[PDB]
Amino acid sequence: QPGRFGDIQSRTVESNDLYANTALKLARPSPGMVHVPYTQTPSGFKYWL
Amino acid sequence: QPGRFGDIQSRTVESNDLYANTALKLARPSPGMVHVPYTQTPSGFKYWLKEKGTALNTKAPFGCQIKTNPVRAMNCAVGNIPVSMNLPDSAFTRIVE
Amino acid sequence: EYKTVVPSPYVKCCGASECSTKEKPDYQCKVYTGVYPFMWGGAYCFCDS
Amino acid sequence: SVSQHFNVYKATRPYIAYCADCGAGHSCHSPVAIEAVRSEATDGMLKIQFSAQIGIDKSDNHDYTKIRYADGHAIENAVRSSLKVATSGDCFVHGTMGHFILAKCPPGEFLQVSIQDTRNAVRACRIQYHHDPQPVGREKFTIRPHYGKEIPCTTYQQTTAKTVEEIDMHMPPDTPDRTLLSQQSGNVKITVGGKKVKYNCTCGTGNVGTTNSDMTINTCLIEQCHVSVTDHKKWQFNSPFVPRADEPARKGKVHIPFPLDNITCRVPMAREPTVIHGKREVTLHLHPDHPTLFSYRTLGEDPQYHEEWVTAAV
Amino acid sequence: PPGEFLQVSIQDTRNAVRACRIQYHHDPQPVGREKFTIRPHYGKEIPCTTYQ
Ligand SMILES: *[C@@H]1O[C@H](CO)[C@@H](O[C@@H]2O[C@H](CO)[C@@H](O)[C@H](O)[C@H]2NC(C)=O)[C@H](O)[C@H]1NC(C)=O
Numbered sequence: 001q002p003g004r005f006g007d008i009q010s011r012t013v014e015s016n017d018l019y020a021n022t023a024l025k026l027a028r029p030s031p032g033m034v035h036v037p038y039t040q041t042p043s044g045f046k047y048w049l
Numbered sequence: 050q051p052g053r054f055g056d057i058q059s060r061t062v063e064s065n066d067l068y069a070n071t072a073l074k075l076a077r078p079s080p081g082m083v084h085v086p087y088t089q090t091p092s093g094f095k096y097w098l099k100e101k102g103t104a105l106n107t108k109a110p111f112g113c114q115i116k117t118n119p120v121r122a123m124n125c126a127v128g129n130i131p132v133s134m135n136l137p138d139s140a141f142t143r144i145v146e
Numbered sequence: 147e148y149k150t151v152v153p154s155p156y157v158k159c160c161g162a163s164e165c166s167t168k169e170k171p172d173y174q175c176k177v178y179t180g181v182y183p184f185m186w187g188g189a190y191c192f193c194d195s
Numbered sequence: 196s197v198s199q200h201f202n203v204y205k206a207t208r209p210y211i212a213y214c215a216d217c218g219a220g221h222s223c224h225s226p227v228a229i230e231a232v233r234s235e236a237t238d239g240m241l242k243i244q245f246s247a248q249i250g251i252d253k254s255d256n257h258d259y260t261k262i263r264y265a266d267g268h269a270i271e272n273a274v275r276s277s278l279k280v281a282t283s284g285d286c287f288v289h290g291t292m293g294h295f296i297l298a299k300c301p302p303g304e305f306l307q308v309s310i311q312d313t314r315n316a317v318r319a320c321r322i323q324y325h326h327d328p329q330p331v332g333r334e335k336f337t338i339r340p341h342y343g344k345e346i347p348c349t350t351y352q353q354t355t356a357k358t359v360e361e362i363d364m365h366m367p368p369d370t371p372d373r374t375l376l377s378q379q380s381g382n383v384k385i386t387v388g389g390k391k392v393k394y395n396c397t398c399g400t401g402n403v404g405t406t407n408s409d410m411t412i413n414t415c416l417i418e419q420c421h422v423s424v425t426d427h428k429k430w431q432f433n434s435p436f437v438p439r440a441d442e443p444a445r446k447g448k449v450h451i452p453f454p455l456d457n458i459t460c461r462v463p464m465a466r467e468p469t470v471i472h473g474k475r476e477v478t479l480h481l482h483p484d485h486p487t488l489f490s491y492r493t494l495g496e497d498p499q500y501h502e503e504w505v506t507a508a509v
Numbered sequence: 510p511p512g513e514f515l516q517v518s519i520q521d522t523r524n525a526v527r528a529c530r531i532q533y534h535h536d537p538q539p540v541g542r543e544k545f546t547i548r549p550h551y552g553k554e555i556p557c558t559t560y561q
């Protein structure tokens with residue numbers, strides 16, 4: 001679950017697969033502008049720490 | 050009263066008369082100095098701005114959206130409205146057809 | 147919010163000046179005796195007291 | 196014209212005023228004394244008023260790289276790249292005009308303004324002023340975001356045109372001085388120095404008056420005479436630290452720059468909260484980046500309102 | 510001013526910098542009963558101690 005422990009999971013350190021759920025959302029860019037706005041819950045590992 | 054809301058009052062923004070009560074007490078100047086000392090209770094308007102309380106915007110019942118200029122409440126869901134209508138004869142259809 | 151208007155003080159050497167009332171909001175006037183103002187050059191008036 | 200905008204300042208002159216604590220915990224008669232600080236702007240751009248003017252040279256002419264200041268009875272000159280304003284760190288001077296500095300500053304308790312003398316000395320005046328701004332909106336950010344919302348908020352412009360508000364100015368008084376007296380055996384000599392001098396004495400009779408030349412009076416002592424400068428053809432700000440002249444009549448008014456104007460200023464959008472459903476309840480995980488205000492209410496007959504300042508994740 | 514660490518620095522003959530830094534919890538409280546920051550221009554005089 002996003003925001004808490006185990007938001008990204010991997011079977012081992014060397015594994016090539018990854019499971020991520022952090023509620024990534026994109027937003028429409030502001031007028032007269034070039035950028036990419038995104039909102040996403042902070043890392044759950046730091047919150048657990 | 051000094052220190053709270055209403056320390057100074059005026060009938061309108063452009064009025065030329067003003068009522069103030071803020072305890073302007075003067076004090077003797079210190080020896081060998083050129084200055085004027087005074088003790089005054091701080092402005093009540095800033096204090097009121099500091100701890101006004103909770104606004105009616107986040108407290109009004111029935112989901113009443115409050116707006117200003119003009120002061121009004123929108124989408125207030127209470128009660129019922131009676132409706133009286135007078136229809137012309139051209140808006141119906143005869144039984145035969 | 148209010149503002150407190152204070153004009154430059156009046157000093158009289160070897161003389162006493164009384165001040166009269168005025169029609170202003172919270173007008174406050176006072177007179178003080180026995181003062182020896184100083185400045186960046188030196189004394190202001192002869193009269194000690 | 197910009198130079199024509201200074202038509203008024205031809206009639207004014209700097210002054211010397213009392214800093215209670217002017218750098219080293221000592222009282223001094225500084226030429227950069229602070230008078231008042233105004234902070235009506237919502238953005239938080241302080242306007243500071245001090246004795247020395249900026250924009251006039253000693254020859255009373257426009258110049259944007261030069262500051263004129265009072266020193267003794269004369270007007271000396273200094274460079275503008277030697278102006279520092281600071282609350283706790285180092286401040287940014289957005290604009291400056293005559294008797295006013297328009298700056299923006301970090302939080303702190305005291306305010307210091309300092310310039311450089313013509314002898315390469317440092318003159319500073321420092322006072323106490325609890326400055327702690329909070330930006331408009333419902334979040335206490337510190338730096339503008341690159342994606343957010345525009346909210347109306349009030350600021351100070353750099354226009355020097357006519358403004359409604361005004362400052363009173365009056366006629367400068369006599370300035371006592373003692374370095375204009377010398378002893379010659381049994382007589383006292385006073386030097387004009389180029390300025391009209393008023394004298395009062397007690398030795399003999401008829402030794403009072405005014406002069407424009409070097410006078411000598413016999414059988415008098417230094418501690419027995421008073422001399423003071425009297426000409427004062429210019430104007431001076433009415434300040435509670437300089438005595439008022441004999442005339443109790445106002446002499447004029449002068450416009451002040453940098454009016455208050457309504458602009459659009461930027462705030463960030465807070466991160467969306469995490470919603471967990473339930474039986475007639477919700478659970479909100481809140482992950483703030485700045486102190487943010489969180490409120491809620493119910494749309495029934497009697498509402499259960501609540502509001503708080505969330506700071507850490509909850 | 511108030512802080513946590515104190516550092517003393519000088520320059521060298523070759524225009525190098527030589528500084529050393531120690532830890533010292535310093536927060537001085539002025540005498541009397543008011544926690545002020547800058548001296549006022551109208552107040553009271555209180556006995557107090559310093560270095561001559
Ligand atoms: C010049 O100074 C003399 C004294 O140094 C002043 O004379 C005093 O005047 C006051 C009131 O007029 C008297 O109460 C004193 O007794 C006077 N002193 C003496 C020694 O006679 C005089 O007023 C001053 N004049 C000006 C124009 O400054």
Ligand SMILES: *[C@@H]1O[C@H](CO)[C@@H](O[C@@H]2O[C@H](CO)[C@@H](O)[C@H](O)[C@H]2NC(C)=O)[C@H](O)[C@H]1NC(C)=O
Pocket residue numbers: 118349455456457
């Ligand atoms: C911010 O915008 C408001 C909206 O226009 C300004 O308020 C008006 O100001 C004019 C001044 O010419 C008044 O005549 C109007 O009566 C005001 N409107 C209201 C609803 O009060 C306001 O002046 C702007 N802020 C600043 C600093 O100018």
